[PDB]
Design an enzyme around this catalytic site. Structure first.
Site, mmCIF file in Angstrom:
data_model
loop_
_atom_site.group_PDB
_atom_site.id
_atom_site.type_symbol
_atom_site.label_atom_id
_atom_site.label_comp_id
_atom_site.label_asym_id
_atom_site.label_seq_id
_atom_site.Cartn_x
_atom_site.Cartn_y
_atom_site.Cartn_z
ATOM 1 N N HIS A 106 35.814 28.984 38.075
ATOM 2 C CA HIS A 106 34.507 28.356 38.053
ATOM 3 C C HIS A 106 34.487 27.034 38.788
ATOM 4 O O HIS A 106 33.415 26.503 39.148
ATOM 5 C CB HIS A 106 33.997 28.221 36.628
ATOM 6 N N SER A 165 32.754 31.842 43.424
ATOM 7 C CA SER A 165 33.341 33.028 44.011
ATOM 8 C C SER A 165 33.412 33.064 45.531
ATOM 9 O O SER A 165 32.541 32.547 46.215
ATOM 10 C CB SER A 165 32.606 34.263 43.494
ATOM 11 N N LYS A 187 24.362 44.317 37.670
ATOM 12 C CA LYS A 187 25.244 44.962 38.612
ATOM 13 C C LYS A 187 26.610 45.052 37.973
ATOM 14 O O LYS A 187 27.497 45.689 38.499
ATOM 15 C CB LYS A 187 25.271 44.212 39.946
ATOM 16 N N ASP A 188 26.784 44.416 36.819
ATOM 17 C CA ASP A 188 28.038 44.574 36.083
ATOM 18 C C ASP A 188 27.920 45.693 35.069
ATOM 19 O O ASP A 188 28.889 46.371 34.768
ATOM 20 C CB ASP A 188 28.406 43.322 35.373
ATOM 21 N N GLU A 229 55.791 55.387 34.172
ATOM 22 C CA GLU A 229 54.397 55.826 34.368
ATOM 23 C C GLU A 229 53.961 55.550 35.820
ATOM 24 O O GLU A 229 54.453 54.621 36.455
ATOM 25 C CB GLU A 229 53.462 55.144 33.370
HETATM 26 C C1 HEM Z 1 44.020 40.172 33.045
HETATM 27 C C2 HEM Z 1 43.680 40.841 34.366
HETATM 28 C C3 HEM Z 1 42.603 40.110 35.175
HETATM 29 C C4 HEM Z 1 41.369 39.810 34.768
HETATM 30 C C5 HEM Z 1 40.797 40.100 33.395
HETATM 31 C C6 HEM Z 1 40.721 39.189 35.753
HETATM 32 C C7 HEM Z 1 39.328 38.735 35.607
HETATM 33 C C8 HEM Z 1 38.704 38.242 36.873
HETATM 34 C C9 HEM Z 1 37.236 38.047 36.964
HETATM 35 C C10 HEM Z 1 36.219 38.306 35.909
HETATM 36 C C11 HEM Z 1 36.974 37.576 38.310
HETATM 37 C C12 HEM Z 1 35.624 37.248 38.891
HETATM 38 C C13 HEM Z 1 34.932 38.554 39.257
HETATM 39 C C14 HEM Z 1 35.611 39.168 40.458
HETATM 40 O O1 HEM Z 1 35.856 38.516 41.464
HETATM 41 O O2 HEM Z 1 35.918 40.330 40.430
HETATM 42 C C15 HEM Z 1 38.289 37.491 38.964
HETATM 43 C C16 HEM Z 1 38.401 37.002 40.348
HETATM 44 C C17 HEM Z 1 39.777 36.703 40.823
HETATM 45 N N1 HEM Z 1 41.003 36.998 40.196
HETATM 46 FE FE1 HEM Z 1 41.297 37.943 38.494
HETATM 47 N N2 HEM Z 1 41.528 39.132 36.911
HETATM 48 C C18 HEM Z 1 42.747 39.686 36.430
HETATM 49 C C19 HEM Z 1 43.994 39.918 37.211
HETATM 50 C C20 HEM Z 1 44.055 39.125 38.473
HETATM 51 C C21 HEM Z 1 44.969 39.380 39.406
HETATM 52 C C22 HEM Z 1 45.990 40.504 39.341
HETATM 53 C C23 HEM Z 1 44.816 38.510 40.382
HETATM 54 C C24 HEM Z 1 45.610 38.427 41.644
HETATM 55 C C25 HEM Z 1 47.085 38.313 41.293
HETATM 56 C C26 HEM Z 1 43.821 37.707 40.098
HETATM 57 C C27 HEM Z 1 43.437 36.584 41.003
HETATM 58 C C28 HEM Z 1 41.956 36.524 41.123
HETATM 59 C C29 HEM Z 1 41.329 35.913 42.126
HETATM 60 C C30 HEM Z 1 42.028 35.224 43.276
HETATM 61 C C31 HEM Z 1 40.009 36.021 41.945
HETATM 62 C C32 HEM Z 1 38.934 35.481 42.860
HETATM 63 C C33 HEM Z 1 38.196 36.648 43.517
HETATM 64 C C34 HEM Z 1 37.156 36.185 44.513
HETATM 65 O O3 HEM Z 1 36.762 35.052 44.480
HETATM 66 O O4 HEM Z 1 36.705 36.947 45.360
HETATM 67 N N3 HEM Z 1 43.270 37.979 38.803
HETATM 68 N N4 HEM Z 1 39.221 37.889 38.074
HETATM 69 C C1 LIG Z 2 32.896 39.288 25.176
HETATM 70 C C2 LIG Z 2 31.987 39.537 26.387
HETATM 71 C C3 LIG Z 2 31.302 38.252 26.865
HETATM 72 C C4 LIG Z 2 31.756 37.849 28.276
HETATM 73 C C5 LIG Z 2 32.636 36.581 28.309
HETATM 74 C C6 LIG Z 2 34.041 36.916 28.834
HETATM 75 C C7 LIG Z 2 33.992 37.526 30.280
HETATM 76 C C8 LIG Z 2 33.262 36.560 31.148
HETATM 77 O O1 LIG Z 2 33.570 35.427 31.438
HETATM 78 O O2 LIG Z 2 32.094 37.152 31.612
HETATM 79 C C9 LIG Z 2 31.727 36.991 33.047
HETATM 80 C C10 LIG Z 2 30.765 38.150 33.314
HETATM 81 C C11 LIG Z 2 33.093 36.953 33.860
HETATM 82 N N1 LIG Z 2 32.797 37.122 35.292
HETATM 83 C C12 LIG Z 2 32.269 38.177 35.893
HETATM 84 O O3 LIG Z 2 32.109 39.239 35.318
HETATM 85 C C13 LIG Z 2 31.838 38.166 37.307
HETATM 86 C C14 LIG Z 2 31.920 37.102 38.178
HETATM 87 C C15 LIG Z 2 31.474 37.266 39.498
HETATM 88 C C16 LIG Z 2 30.935 38.474 39.963
HETATM 89 C C17 LIG Z 2 30.849 39.575 39.113
HETATM 90 N N2 LIG Z 2 30.372 40.820 39.374
HETATM 91 C C18 LIG Z 2 29.845 41.254 40.626
HETATM 92 O O4 LIG Z 2 29.813 40.480 41.536
HETATM 93 C C19 LIG Z 2 31.300 39.426 37.778
HETATM 94 O O5 LIG Z 2 31.212 40.410 37.058
HETATM 95 C C20 LIG Z 2 33.888 38.198 33.504
HETATM 96 O O6 LIG Z 2 33.507 39.346 33.518
HETATM 97 O O7 LIG Z 2 35.097 37.834 33.025
HETATM 98 C C21 LIG Z 2 35.619 38.744 31.925
HETATM 99 C C22 LIG Z 2 37.081 39.070 32.208
HETATM 100 C C23 LIG Z 2 35.474 37.626 30.756
HETATM 101 O O8 LIG Z 2 36.054 38.408 29.629
HETATM 102 C C24 LIG Z 2 37.101 37.619 29.051
HETATM 103 O O9 LIG Z 2 37.276 36.491 29.488
HETATM 104 C C25 LIG Z 2 37.922 38.175 27.937
HETATM 105 C C26 LIG Z 2 39.099 37.227 27.727
HETATM 106 C C27 LIG Z 2 37.014 38.299 26.702
#
Ligand code: HEM
Ligand SMILES: CCCCCC[C@H]1C(=O)O[C@H](C)[C@H](NC(=O)c2cccc(NC=O)c2O)C(=O)O[C@@H](C)[C@@H]1OC(=O)C(C)C
Ligand code: HEM
Ligand code: HEM
Lengths: 60, 378, 79, 76, 241
Positions: free
Chosen positions: B200, B204, B226-227, B270
């Site tokens: 944040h 993004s 869209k989510d 796996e």
């Molecule tokens: C516990 C597994 C993970 C969760 C729950 C998680 C959750 C998220 C979420 C909600 C976003 C913003 C939405 C999106 O861009 O899709 C994000 C973006 C990102 N995550 Fe993760 N992610 C996880 C694993 C990773 C991994 C494997 C990496 C890379 C090693 C990573 C590095 C990033 C980066 C760099 C972004 C920025 C994406 C962008 O700005 O385009 N995170 N993640």
């Molecule tokens: C309990 C549900 C309330 C939501 C609060 C927690 C969840 C939360 O923080 O919500 C927002 C939705 C967070 N970001 C996005 O989704 C998101 C961000 C940029 C773009 C897109 N999509 C398409 O462009 C996205 O979808 C996201 O999706 O992160 C999850 C991993 C997180 O979830 C977590 O933390 C877990 C540790 C709970």
């Protein structure tokens, strides 16, 4: 004579009250009718059930 | 005054998915962040319902799972959603990291890095996960792997037996793994929030790598719906497995209990560790094999130090775009080889794929970058 | 964190938009849809497809030689 | 009529009627003649030598394939 | 021995996507289990009650349960007698100690049958083929004692006697107990002994497809609506002078 969708909006969709009331009232009847038609479709394409097998064992 | 903004709690929620400005620009490759979230909770959620019926104890381990599948009302869908959700959690994790490299997202150091920490932990978790039912794959899977720490000079032995609770895998090892498989996803869940915290700070990245400040849209409508759609798609897939092909991605032999006497010539971790598996044994070394296995994943944390290009996304970079796909296909190769026995063709080709992997990420992509600079006159 | 109003500086751009209840959600879904995905596919085949057929060729030849290595093995052992 | 009755409680099986009918088409007679050639071949020099598992399996593949195609229509 | 062969695609009555098992055929199969396999093959997980909804009926299940005698709980003197048969307990049968399976069948373990269809690659077809497969050893070859021949088997050297054609019966109403008819039925039952949920699973699966068939388009038309404001937005750049 307006439209179905129009008349529908006025009487039920406008207020979030009736709007929500409509969907809880509409979900009850949907769960029932969708489960009927569905299972029926599931049986019609089958028939090696335990349904048609019973006729044979009303006794013991 | 709008309570949605000044209340200590809502603030967080407003900042998370209501008022947060996002690129009008992101595409489907950005959904896997919600999907990973969803995955994480659904996993935590079915996982818990299995724990109200599961056991531990080597004697009852296998028995309890079958108990669930056959006796526990609906235990089967729960069990299979858990096991299939686990695979989906990898498909997304994989896709996420993919999206990341292509688009240059890794330039957010802290965020990327937390994500690597997020990768190792869910890997470490899912590993312990499959040891639980106490099947054949579970036993030697739990053996072939863990051992690796025995390659560590001077103290390898000590550690592998310390993680074991004995001299082999038994009593001490199943309860251990269950407990760890229980506490990890909570810890992960925390780390995720910190991941998201650091995210944040910059907002993004987007398909162009340019900078969307000039055109941001509110998360409200837009990315919430869209989510939702997106999550529905993830449900379709997870349900397709569970309800039509429950064991398609599952090794049929984790059925049939354990047996420290056997070992069924085949055995592979796996699917989601196959590429890694291939790497390790594509090296005639105990130390080198495991050393190479580590580098295979820990190299992600190296990527940013080899960004060489003057552009951020690969959206306008044909040369690198080619090396990206060569990487993917090559990983699909490693996955395939990993799945095969260590014999004739399979050896040398999986040995080439390994070298390719490391040479591609360490030399090829960084050079493709510089040439593109030079071509553009940058 | 960053809020609207403190993002960045914008000069002279007008943006006209329309209410969702006033337009179609699927303007020319197929009419304009298909042509475009053809266009995007075309625009990218050459960078995505090649590495995959390469894997494809190596996969079929790889299993081939794996069977023909053992099964085919005998072969000849004549004396 | 009565002769067919003893034939039932003493014989009869849809697998053999089909096997023999499948053991008849192109790929089979060919896979059997590759198998008979080797059959003779190793029991020709009937002493001190290799194997012939291989040529049998190819025959069973080709047969059991078309076996599965029609077989199940006869059962119940 | 190093080389192998894989099964064909027998068109099971439950191979298709939304295809239920043949309950009449699951019945005959249990019969094949009880008379034949049950004296060598443990089936620790299935029980007489599990059969209740599936094939048999209430009273029928009781009766089949009563045709054996299991060791019930100890009594006041610390006894452990025997009793008719409930419905409650399973089919723990052939041998006590596992090595006692080895002492009978020469050094071979006839593994649990609850397993089977999901523990062996190919599933039903491998068991179907392994049973109706049974062929004769060609040249080269050997065998120890009666380590019978089977092509659909790792190494071809099994320890299992071919208890197929011994035409046993009780196919109520009238069903020819031929080798093949007997094999389909065991398998069909064995499918159900591994994945009981099988039919419900696919029943839901139908609803899952049918539901998503209304939802996917809908939750998609919803997202369009909201994004349509953005999709048809018009920009104009009007700099000074
Ligand atoms: C516990 C597994 C993970 C969760 C729950 C998680 C959750 C998220 C979420 C909600 C976003 C913003 C939405 C999106 O861009 O899709 C994000 C973006 C990102 N995550 Fe993760 N992610 C996880 C694993 C990773 C991994 C494997 C990496 C890379 C090693 C990573 C590095 C990033 C980066 C760099 C972004 C920025 C994406 C962008 O700005 O385009 N995170 N993640
Ligand atoms: C309990 C549900 C309330 C939501 C609060 C927690 C969840 C939360 O923080 O919500 C927002 C939705 C967070 N970001 C996005 O989704 C998101 C961000 C940029 C773009 C897109 N999509 C398409 O462009 C996205 O979808 C996201 O999706 O992160 C999850 C991993 C997180 O979830 C977590 O933390 C877990 C540790 C709970
Ligand atoms: C803290 C919430 C979780 C709990 C309570 C939990 C508990 C369990 C239990 C008791 C089992 C054995 C029952 C069974 O095998 O079906 C199991 C299996 C498994 N779970 Fe979890 N787990 C949780 C989170 C996870 C996570 C985060 C993952 C990683 C995606 C995961 C992946 C697995 C795997 C791979 C298995 C074994 C595979 C299989 O079922 O065949 N679970 N879990
Ligand atoms: C229709 C009833 C039976 C069925 C369906 C059945 C099926 C099977 C199957 C599928 C296997 C394991 C195959 C594999 O490993 O891939 C097996 C192993 C075996 N069963 Fe049976 N069997 C039945 C009756 C018997 C009987 C009557 C005996 C007593 C001779 C028997 C003794 C064995 C033995 C000895 C093995 C060991 C084979 C080996 O692993 O070497 N089974 N059986």
């Amino acid at each position: 004579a307006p439209t179905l969708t129009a008349r529908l909006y006025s009487l039920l969709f406008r207020r979030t009250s009736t709007f929500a009331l409509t969907i809880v009232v509409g979900a009850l009847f949907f769960e029932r009718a969708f489960d009927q038609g569905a299972d029926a479709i599931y049986e019609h394409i089958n028939e090696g059930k335990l349904w048609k097998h019973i006729k044979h064992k009303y006794e013991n | 005054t709008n309570i949605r903004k000044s209340h200590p709690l809502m603030k967080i929620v407003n900042n998370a998915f209501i008022d947060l400005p996002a690129p009008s620009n992101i595409s489907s490759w950005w959904n896997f962040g919600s999907l990973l979230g969803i995955c994480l909770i659904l996993q935590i959620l079915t996982g818990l319902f299995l724990a109200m019926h599961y056991t531990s104890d080597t004697t009852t381990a296998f028995s309890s799972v079958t108990h669930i599948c056959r006796d526990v009302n609906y235990g089967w869908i729960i069990r299979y959603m858990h096991a299939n959700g686990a695979s989906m959690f990898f498909i997304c994790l994989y896709m996420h990291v993919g999206r990341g490299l292509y688009y240059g997202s890794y330039t957010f150091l802290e965020t990327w890095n937390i994500g690597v920490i997020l990768l190792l932990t869910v890997m470490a978790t899912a590993f312990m996960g499959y040891v639980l039912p106490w099947g054949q794959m579970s036993f030697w899977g739990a053996t072939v792997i863990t051992n690796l720490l025995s390659a560590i000079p001077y103290i390898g032995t000590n550690l592998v037996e310390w993680i074991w609770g004995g001299f082999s895998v038994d009593k001490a090892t199943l309860t251990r793994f269950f407990a760890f498989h229980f506490i990890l996803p909570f810890i992960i869940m925390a780390i995720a929030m910190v991941h998201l915290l650091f995210l944040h700070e910059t907002g993004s990245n987007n398909p162009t790598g340019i900078s969307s400040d000039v055109d941001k849209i509110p998360f409200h409508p837009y990315y919430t719906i869209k989510d939702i759609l997106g999550a529905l798609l993830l449900i379709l897939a997870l349900m397709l497995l569970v309800l039509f092909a429950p064991d398609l991605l599952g090794d049929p032999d984790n059925y049939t209990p354990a047996n420290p006497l056997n070992t069924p010539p085949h055995i592979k971790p796996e699917w989601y560790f196959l590429f890694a598996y291939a790497i390790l044994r594509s090296i005639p070394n105990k130390l080198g094999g495991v050393l190479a296995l580590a580098f295979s994943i820990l190299i992600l944390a190296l990527i940013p130090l080899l960004h060489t290009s003057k552009q951020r996304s690969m959206m306008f970079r044909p040369l690198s775009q080619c090396l990206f796909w060569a990487l993917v296909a090559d990983l699909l190769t490693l996955t395939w080889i990993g799945g095969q026995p260590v014999e004739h063709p399979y050896i040398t080709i999986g040995q080439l794929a390994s070298v390719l992997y490391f040479l591609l990420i360490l030399v090829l992509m960084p050079t493709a970058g510089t040439i593109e600079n030079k071509l553009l006159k940058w | 964190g960053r809020q609207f109003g403190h993002l960045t500086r914008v000069r002279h751009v007008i943006t006209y938009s329309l209410s969702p209840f006033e337009q179609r959600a699927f303007p020319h879904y197929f009419s304009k849809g298909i042509p475009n995905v053809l266009r995007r596919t075309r625009a990218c085949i050459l960078r995505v497809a090649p590495p995959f057929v390469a894997f494809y060729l190596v996969y079929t030849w790889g299993t081939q030689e794996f069977e023909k290595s053992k099964r085919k093995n005998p072969a000849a052992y004549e004396n | 009529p009565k002769e067919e009755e003893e034939e039932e409680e003493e014989l009869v099986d849809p697998l053999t009627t089909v096997r023999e009918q499948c053991e008849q088409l192109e790929k089979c007679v060919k896979a059997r003649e590759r198998l008979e050639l080797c059959d003779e071949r190793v029991s020709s020099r009937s002493q001190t030598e290799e194997d012939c598992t291989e040529e049998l399996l190819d025959f069973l593949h080709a047969r059991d394939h078309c076996v599965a195609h029609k077989l199940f229509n006869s059962l119940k | 021995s190093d080389l192998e062969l894989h099964p064909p695609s027998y068109p099971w009555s439950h191979r298709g996507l939304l295809s239920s098992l043949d309950h009449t055929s699951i019945r005959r199969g249990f019969q094949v289990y009880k008379q034949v396999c049950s004296s060598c093959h443990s089936m620790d997980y299935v029980a007489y009650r599990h059969l209740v909804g599936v094939c048999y009926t209430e009273d029928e299940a009781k009766a089949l349960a009563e045709e054996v005698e299991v060791q019930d709980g100890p009594n006041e003197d610390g006894e452990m007698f025997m009793r008719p048969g409930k419905l409650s307990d399973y089919f723990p049968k052939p041998y006590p100690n596992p090595e006692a399976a080895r002492a009978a069948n020469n050094g071979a373990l006839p593994p649990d049958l609850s397993y089977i269809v999901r523990a062996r690659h190919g599933g039903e077809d491998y068991v179907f083929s392994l049973l109706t497969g049974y062929c004769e050893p060609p040249t080269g070859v050997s065998l120890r004692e009666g380590l019978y021949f089977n092509p659909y088997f790792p190494g071809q050297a099994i320890g299992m006697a071919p208890p197929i054609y011994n035409e046993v019966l009780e196919f109520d109403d009238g069903t020819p107990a031929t080798m093949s008819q007997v094999a389909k039925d065991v398998c069909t039952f064995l499918r159900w002994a591994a994945e009981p949920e099988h039919d419900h699973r696919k029943r839901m699966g139908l609803k899952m497809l049918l539901m998503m068939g209304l939802l996917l388009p809908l939750v998609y038309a919803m997202k369009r609506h909201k994004w349509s404001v953005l999709k048809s937005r018009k920009l104009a750049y009007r700099p000074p002078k």
